[PDB]
Design a protein around this ligand. Sequence first.
Ligand code: BOG
Ligand code: UND
Ligand code: TL
Ligand code: TL
Lengths: 419, 420
Amino acid sequence: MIELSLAEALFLILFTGVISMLISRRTGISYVPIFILTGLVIGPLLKLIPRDLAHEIFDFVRVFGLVIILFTEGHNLSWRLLKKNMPTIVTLDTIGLILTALIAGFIFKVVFNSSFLLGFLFGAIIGATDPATLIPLFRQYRVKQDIETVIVTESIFNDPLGIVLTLIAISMLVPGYGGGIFSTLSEKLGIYAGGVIYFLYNVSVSISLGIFLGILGYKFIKRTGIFDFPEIEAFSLSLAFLGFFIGERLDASGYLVATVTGIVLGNYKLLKPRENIRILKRLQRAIEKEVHFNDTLAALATIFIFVLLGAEMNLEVIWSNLGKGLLVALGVMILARPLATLPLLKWWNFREYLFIALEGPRGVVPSALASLPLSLALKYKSPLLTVHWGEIIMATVVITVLTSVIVETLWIPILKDKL
Amino acid sequence: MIELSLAEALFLILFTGVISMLISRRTGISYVPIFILTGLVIGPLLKLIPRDLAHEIFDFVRVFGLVIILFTEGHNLSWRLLKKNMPTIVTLDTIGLILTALIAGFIFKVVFNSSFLLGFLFGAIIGATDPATLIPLFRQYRVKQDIETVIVTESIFNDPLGIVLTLIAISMLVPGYGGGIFSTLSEKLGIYAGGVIYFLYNVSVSISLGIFLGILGYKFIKRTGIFDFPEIEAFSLSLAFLGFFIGERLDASGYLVATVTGIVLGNYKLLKPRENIRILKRLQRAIEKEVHFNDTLAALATIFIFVLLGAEMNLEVIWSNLGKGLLVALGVMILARPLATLPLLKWWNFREYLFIALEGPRGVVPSALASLPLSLALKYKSPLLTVHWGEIIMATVVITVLTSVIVETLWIPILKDKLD
Ligand SMILES: CCCCCCCCO[C@@H]1O[C@H](CO)[C@@H](O)[C@H](O)[C@H]1O
Ligand SMILES: CCCCCCCCCCC
Ligand SMILES: [Tl+]
Ligand SMILES: [Tl+]
């Protein structure tokens, strides 16, 4: 605890996270458990970074980090690969996501003895997936591309869709956090109906404003000539955060807005420019630079998120509920997940569907949403969501992230040969 | 009291700053008064960004910003051009800087009926130079590459040294700031000898540590194979701040350590000859990626610094002493700089000397250290430095920056066509 409380803590997270990243690449082991372990070392163990600083930093890193993460994830998306295998993807992010959210919710409620709403909070938090761990092994194991594309795309589209479900599941238990459209719509049309209508509204408006601001920004780049350093990176950053803030100002998921914007800018090629060659080549250069910068920021954000999650956990609650946590984990990675991917069996084989379903692990987004109910319960004390359930949900999320990551990372060589 | 949301405030500053940057590039107007006027619009006038909130943000933006900016700036230094023009820039960064701070401080002391310490604080603040607002007009008029090299390098070295001089002046006013060594010497030798010996200590230790960390980092990159995304950027950032914190824990200028580190990293080919071609390729790849990211961050930090400076100022005190601040500013531009640059004509002609001694403006660093004594006054209670004197210092720094940038960027063609 000799270090500076604020600055040197941040720098400690950065430094140790970087070293952890290096040794992760060198070892070949996943970056998730390495980062979590690092946080565990500098956090709970060595007591260098107490939970207070962890929360305070995580309150900013949540917003900035998640926004930039979803933006860069939007960038690394090719719409053609999506269109080639659309139906098997679009439905699972529309239905399968909510389905596994409900099954995880129930299977959480029946073991931790709570409300279906809190269980649904856990499920919504843990909704998004992260297959970035599997990719380094996929490329060297030469697994089929047709599944990699649909899994990665699935993650790209479910990441912001897990935040909105978390945002609404929270808004139910705490009255203050929800406001504007949700309050009135829910007050006039009940919880369920008003919630579904609010969901559709949020998604539709987010996609609309996303495409709008994406194309508008893309045209603004040409109209005023933004190709050179440092205007492109700065303007793109400001664009993403513009989408987020005015997307949230009219009460809608600005995260999904930023994601869709990243999709638009990421696929400028298909925007029908009818423009000259010079402009498009130099614009390709500019977009590449911007992608580099923002992806660096997203890397730093990823590291910070995982390390903070590792340094914000308390081993007391976790060890107190380890068996239950593992039970929930295996409950959502073996039971909830395949039964939520049933419609995928329509266009896919038995073993293929089994693979795709069973495979998906949880990562960045659930890690960044884990401490949210806790941190919110501490500030806005509600009898439905207290500190106890905050610790419970968070611990369960961390447990499931770790478990899913390690287990699903380790069981692919044999499963490849079996199929 | 804080009104607008923090995240929305930060975003507002970023957005308006970017738009202002575009407008500044297209119009040809220097980005300094554009940013300052932008912040001025969103700051005092509209009260979108509360002055207290501006303070709280600035306290972070200066620490992160100055470090990343100086570290990046260190890469833009050529050791060959440094060796070819050593005594000149050495005379500039040492003698010229200190003398400038002293005489400008004397002017401020005379005008505002100040003490010697407050004046020296002002001079130390406006000691640094930022010729980045002159580069376009330099490479458009095809001015001599020599004087451009000299000016730019002088900026590179005198930017952190200006913070040290400010650190000195700050430590002499508030009891808490002066840490470790400086205190000992100060209570043993006195403020003069203590300040000088601590200056030498800070400079030497920061430079040596910067070289050590630069070489160590280079060897680590070369060894472990830190060549590709995203290892190089993250690691270089971690190193850039490692130098800062380590340097600050040794009671030295961490900014100077980061700067020297950037100097070492920028000149990677020089550290080892005979090294394989492929190695130089990969190393240049990594270095270019790093430079891209960190320079982008430095640009954002510059935007934030200038805009925040614009949003922080209060027009009351400024307009109350506009003539005084302008008088001090003209005293710095006309008297201070050339009088401190007089021994430079031992290697250059009178015209070249005059150009050099009339071009150097005040930009980023003095703009980030503008409200530092004011902030400290609001933080700690000292019988020497008060609040309103911090207001005076800040406002005078603002006027100085604006006038220096505007005028010394404006008179470039008239001055050049007469001199060279
Ligand atoms: C003005 C000097 C600051 C550096 C400007 C670099 C402009 C080009 O930026 C380039 O972006 C590329 C995107 O892939 C990176 O791979 C390169 O490393 C980077 O140099
Ligand atoms: C309060 C102590 C509770 C102990 C629970 C430990 C769970 C370990 C499960 C191992 C499968
Ligand atoms: Tl994802
Ligand atoms: Tl400079």
